Write a protein that binds this ligand. Structure first.
Ligand SMILES: [Cl-]
Ligand code: NA
Ligand code: NA
Ligand code: NA
Ligand code: NA
Ligand code: NA
Ligand code: NA
Ligand code: NA
Ligand code: NA
Length: 234
């Protein structure tokens, strides 16, 4: 038995093509495989993770199934949890690889956050787009009632707000405090998001648990520019 080199103990998404080649040679020795042909897996580790098991079998009639299993065993068991983390951290390529390997696009943590909530909150537009294209629940509430549109409106991510609306986000969804996305955009001073929400049917007269409209919130915060938009339309 041979120990795997230290840089190959990194997750395979980080492996170069030369790293892949070293891993193959390590496996040839560790598992007593038929000699591996040097031109056979001419790609980096990110690409390797997108091959199917059938692809491995075709590429290596003698060892490809074994190599596929070895590679998959390197990955953590809970890909849905990894997807939540990758989406939160903006790891767009990792998001794509994890969903290709079966991660649930609607993976949910103990706060009710989904990948879409986390990518929306942290401004990761490309990840929002890939999640939506692959069936992400656009109107899922988290435990406090926050939808992805709430999360993008509160955090000032205008393009994400627009994409969520184009994919069916509920413009007048309520969180557990009765806040709509319009309330949260007003609370955090995002004037352009307020305009987009109104153009998509946001209810200026919606009252939260405190009896307050988005306009009331703009007055409490002294944000006269936001109050002006809201006043015009109600
Ligand atoms: Cl999953
Ligand atoms: Na590379
Ligand atoms: Na290298
Ligand atoms: Na090949
Ligand atoms: Na696969
Ligand atoms: Na290994
Ligand atoms: Na999983
Ligand atoms: Na889940
Ligand atoms: Na940001």
């Amino acid at each position: 038995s041979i120990r795997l080199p230290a840089h190959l103990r990194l997750q395979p998404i980080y492996w170069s093509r030369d790293d892949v080649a070293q891993w193959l040679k390590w496996a040839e020795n560790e598992f007593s495989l038929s000699p591996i042909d040097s031109n056979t897996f001419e790609m980096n580790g990110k690409a390797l993770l997108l091959l199917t098991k059938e692809d491995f079998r075709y590429r290596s009639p003698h060892s490809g199934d074994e190599l596929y299993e070895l590679l998959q065993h390197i990955l953590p068991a809970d890909l849905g949890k990894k997807l939540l983390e990758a989406a939160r951290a903006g790891q767009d390529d990792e998001v794509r690889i994890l969903m290709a390997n079966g991660a649930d696009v609607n993976a949910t943590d103990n706060d009710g956050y989904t990948p879409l909530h986390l990518a929306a909150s942290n401004g990761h537009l490309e990840i929002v787009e890939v999640l939506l294209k692959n069936g992400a629940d656009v109107n899922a509430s988290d435990l406090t009632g926050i939808t992805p549109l709430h999360a993008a409106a509160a955090t000032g991510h205008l393009e994400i707000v627009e994409v969520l609306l184009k994919h069916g986000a509920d413009v007048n969804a309520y969180d557990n405090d009765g806040h709509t996305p319009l309330h949260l955009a007003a609370k955090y001073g995002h004037l352009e998001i307020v305009e987009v929400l109104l153009k998509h049917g946001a209810d200026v007269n919606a009252q939260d648990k405190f009896g307050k409209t988005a306009f009331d919130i703009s007055i409490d915060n002294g944000n006269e520019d936001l109050a002006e938009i809201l006043q015009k339309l109600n």
